Amino acid sequence: MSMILKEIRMNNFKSHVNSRIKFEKGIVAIIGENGSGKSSIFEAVFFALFGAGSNFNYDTIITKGKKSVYVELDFEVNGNNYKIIREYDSGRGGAKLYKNGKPYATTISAVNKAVNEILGVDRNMFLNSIYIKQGEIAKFLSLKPSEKLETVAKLLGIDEFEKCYQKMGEIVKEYEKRLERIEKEKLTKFVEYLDKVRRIFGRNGFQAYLREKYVPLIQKYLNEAFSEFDLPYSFVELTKDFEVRVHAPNGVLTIDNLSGGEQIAVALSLRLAIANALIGNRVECIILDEPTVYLDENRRAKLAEIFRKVKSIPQMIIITHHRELEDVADVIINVKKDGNVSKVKING
Amino acid sequence: MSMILKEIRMNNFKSHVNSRIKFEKGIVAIIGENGSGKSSIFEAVFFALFGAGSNFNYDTIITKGKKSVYVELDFEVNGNNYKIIREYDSGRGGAKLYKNGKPYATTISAVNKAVNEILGVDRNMFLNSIYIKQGEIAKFLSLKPSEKLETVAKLLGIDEFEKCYQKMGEIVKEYEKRLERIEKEKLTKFVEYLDKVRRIFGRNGFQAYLREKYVPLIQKYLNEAFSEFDLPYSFVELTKDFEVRVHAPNGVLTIDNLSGGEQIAVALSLRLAIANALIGNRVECIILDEPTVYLDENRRAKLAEIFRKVKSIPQMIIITHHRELEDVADVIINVKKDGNVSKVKING
Numbered sequence: 001m002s003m004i005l006k007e008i009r010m011n012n013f014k015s016h017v018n019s020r021i022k023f024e025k026g027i028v029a030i031i032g033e034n035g036s037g038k039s040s041i042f043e044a045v046f047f048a049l050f051g052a053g054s055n056f057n058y059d060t061i062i063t064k065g066k067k068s069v070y071v072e073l074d075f076e077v078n079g080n081n082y083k084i085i086r087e088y089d090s091g092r093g094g095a096k097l098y099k100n101g102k103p104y105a106t107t108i109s110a111v112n113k114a115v116n117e118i119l120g121v122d123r124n125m126f127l128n129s130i131y132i133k134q135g136e137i138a139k140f141l142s143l144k145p146s147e148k149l150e151t152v153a154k155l156l157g158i159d160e161f162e163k164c165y166q167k168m169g170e171i172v173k174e175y176e177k178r179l180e181r182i183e184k185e186k187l188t189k190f191v192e193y194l195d196k197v198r199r200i201f202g203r204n205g206f207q208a209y210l211r212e213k214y215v216p217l218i219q220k221y222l223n224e225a226f227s228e229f230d231l232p233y234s235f236v237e238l239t240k241d242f243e244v245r246v247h248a249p250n251g252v253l254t255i256d257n258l259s260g261g262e263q264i265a266v267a268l269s270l271r272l273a274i275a276n277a278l279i280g281n282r283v284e285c286i287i288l289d290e291p292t293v294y295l296d297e298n299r300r301a302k303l304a305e306i307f308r309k310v311k312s313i314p315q316m317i318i319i320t321h322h323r324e325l326e327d328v329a330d331v332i333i334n335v336k337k338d339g340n341v342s343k344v345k346i347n348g
Numbered sequence: 349m350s351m352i353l354k355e356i357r358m359n360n361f362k363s364h365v366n367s368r369i370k371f372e373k374g375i376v377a378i379i380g381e382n383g384s385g386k387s388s389i390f391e392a393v394f395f396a397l398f399g400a401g402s403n404f405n406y407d408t409i410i411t412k413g414k415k416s417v418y419v420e421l422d423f424e425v426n427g428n429n430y431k432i433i434r435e436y437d438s439g440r441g442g443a444k445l446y447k448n449g450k451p452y453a454t455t456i457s458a459v460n461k462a463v464n465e466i467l468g469v470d471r472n473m474f475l476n477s478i479y480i481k482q483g484e485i486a487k488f489l490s491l492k493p494s495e496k497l498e499t500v501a502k503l504l505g506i507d508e509f510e511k512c513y514q515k516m517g518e519i520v521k522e523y524e525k526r527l528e529r530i531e532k533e534k535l536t537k538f539v540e541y542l543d544k545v546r547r548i549f550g551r552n553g554f555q556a557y558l559r560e561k562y563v564p565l566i567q568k569y570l571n572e573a574f575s576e577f578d579l580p581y582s583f584v585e586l587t588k589d590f591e592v593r594v595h596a597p598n599g600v601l602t603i604d605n606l607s608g609g610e611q612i613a614v615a616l617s618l619r620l621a622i623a624n625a626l627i628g629n630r631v632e633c634i635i636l637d638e639p640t641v642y643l644d645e646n647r648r649a650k651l652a653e654i655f656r657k658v659k660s661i662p663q664m665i666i667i668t669h670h671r672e673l674e675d676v677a678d679v680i681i682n683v684k685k686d687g688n689v690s691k692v693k694i695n696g
């Protein structure tokens with residue numbers, strides 16, 4: 001479900017022609033001027049995990065200099081130590097996966113089947129459960145009440161149209177028109193369980209469901225976040241429409257009714273509660289990219305002190321170009337670009 | 349979704365060596381001494397609709413005399429006229445289906461695929477949405493509060509374990525181990541939509557869902573039934589656990605808190621509301637088999653007068669051996685067994 005990033009190592013990956021980075025538990029701050037190669041680090045981490053896509057343009061990741069790339073990630077998931085190695089050289093691609101120090105998967109395909117079964121989530125759901133994009137917090141606070149519920153709906157992925165069963169129940173149907181031309185009955189038994197299923201959703205019931213699965217969860221965590229962040233509100237409600245209702249002393253309040261500082265806390269609390277909800281577990285690692293961008297000096301300070309109260313999450317990686325945030329991290333990874341080649345250094 | 353039975357015709361079907369029966373809209377009473385061949389009529393109707401099962405013992409339906417059976421059903425579904433013909437003679441079976449007077453399906457298999465797509469439900473769900481077994485009402489009223497919710501859960505079919513995807517996502521997986529031995533990528537695209545789906549239920553969320561889909565529905569109809577049956581209660585609640593709460597003047601009441609007569613009304617109301625819920629539409633036809641069995645003279649009378657108030661359902665077939673119920677029907681189909689052969693006659 002949720003992992004711990006241990007060590008990434010890249011070769012000819014975009015700006016990083018040769019970089020090795022070790023991550024620690026606690027708060028990790030990847031600090032470096034804009035364009036220095038920070039986001040590529042995690043680009044490499046994600047590429048290591050799900051490799052290239054179908055018909056993927058390998059020029060995007062390979063440092064323009066040559067035609068060869070190699071990334072090695074050491075992560076741990078639910079008590080196990082994994083080492084994923086993904087590489088590509090001149091049209092030749094490969095992938096290997098190790099579990100507790102022994103080979104587990106040796107082929108690009110088997111490595112994927114294994115990775116997918118280790119996380120228990122797909123590429124996108126996993127990405128939303130661990131990576132918080134630049135400006136999310138500021139943008140959330142900018143949206144109008146009705147838009148806030150919108151973004152929550154998105155993060156959860158409510159856009160689901162199981163019409164795929166069309167091709168599904170059919171391509172796996174005709175398979176029997178070749179069984180009727182003078183045992184294989186099982187192939188019917190499941191074509192039914194396909195209808196019995198597609199027959200209970202209708203394309204519009206799948207949403208009514210998700211609101212049932214997530215909302216409960218999100219509200220649970222949102223409340224825990226509140227205690228961790230010391231917000232003065234015993235109960236936080238989350239309507240089935242994703243509206244945040246803070247039960248204050250004199251009556252329910254909406255994020256918009258709160259002070260700048262408290263709004264930051266709630267927004268962070270919500271985005272975290274959602275990440276936990278996507279994986280149905282308390283996240284082990286969360287990566288925030290330039291989370292204080294678009295925030296005035298006041299709200300930056302607030303988030304800074306809130307970061308300091310984050311102890312419920314084992315590993316929190318904050319990427320920034322603001323060096324003041326250095327006073328919040330337990331570890332500091334400086335990144336400097338040297339005329340096209342990134343350099344990483346763990347000091348400060 | 350829901351049909352109207354027009355005409356059934358059987359040949360060598362159990363007790364009915366040769367019987368032809370026409371049904372009408374309104375209340376139809378199939379009256380006849382125990383063992384006279386009433387339930388076979390509808391056995392034939394159901395057999396006509398879904399034919400024999402896989403490796404089905406044709407001695408059960410074929411009149412013991414010989415080895416040949418033939419059933420022809422004329423029903424209408426959602427504005428269309430259908431004629432289904434199912435037959436079997438000496439190991440040779442066949443099936444034909446006509447829509448609005450023209451051939452539609454000519455092979456046992458194509459006839460099934462067509463029938464299933466016309467009803468929009470499987471054999472069992474359809475059977476619970478149209479056939480109310482003997483003693484259901486009396487038994488329901490006999491059960492203990494906690495058992496009542498139990499039976500509701502059953503009728504809805506909450507027993508669902510999508511673990512079938514095991515064989516599913518796998519038998520349709522290895523299909524690619526034969527694609528990796530030096531386009532067919534689509535076969536992956538849907539193996540994912542299979543996980544993305546099986547990955548959101550977990551075998552225990554599918555129930556939390558059904559309660560969301562049905563309960564709302566059942567409560568809606570239960571209330572309509574109340575008005576049709578003239579019950580003195582503006583609102584009837586149906587908890588997410590399937591408990592019936594009658595909002596009377598002095599406080600909520602449970603079926604058990606009501607008078608014998610009112611309990612019959614509620615039970616009938618509930619079993620009807622469920623049938624509508626299974627097909628997500630107001631039933632067109634409902635068949636009650638010996639619904640007054642196990643009911644004392646009082647409660648029989650009550651149900652009798654309630655039957656008379658049933659106008660919301662286009663066709664209601666009541667099978668019984670009690671001739672007094674004849675005073676409730678718009679049409680009467682007498683059934684007499686003549687030493688092993690049933691005889692049907694529409695008089696009285």
Ligand SMILES: Nc1ncnc2c1ncn2[C@@H]1O[C@H](COP(=O)(O)OP(=O)(O)O)[C@@H](O)[C@H]1O
Binds near residue numbers: 015
């Ligand atoms: N394939 C590549 N080869 C060499 N350099 C690349 C390649 N792709 C991107 N870059 C360089 O990476 C730089 C960006 O690093 P950057 O992503 O801005 O780190 P951060 O996100 O922390 O600011 C760009 O300026 C670009 O020139």
Ligand SMILES: Nc1ncnc2c1ncn2[C@@H]1O[C@H](COP(=O)(O)OP(=O)(O)O)[C@@H](O)[C@H]1O
Binds near residue numbers: 383388
């Ligand atoms: N294959 C068969 N051939 C001839 N008679 C049969 C066959 N199967 C069942 N029967 C007869 O049908 C009779 C039952 O008709 P029945 O179902 O009791 O009508 P109802 O249900 O309205 O009482 C049984 O007594 C049995 O002898």
Ligand SMILES: [Mg+2]
Binds near residue numbers: 038039040289
């Ligand atoms: Mg960046």
Ligand SMILES: [Mg+2]
Binds near residue numbers: 293319320321322
């Ligand atoms: Mg920042």
Ligand SMILES: [Mg+2]
Binds near residue numbers: 637
């Ligand atoms: Mg009977």
Ligand SMILES: [Mg+2]
Binds near residue numbers: 639
């Ligand atoms: Mg009766």
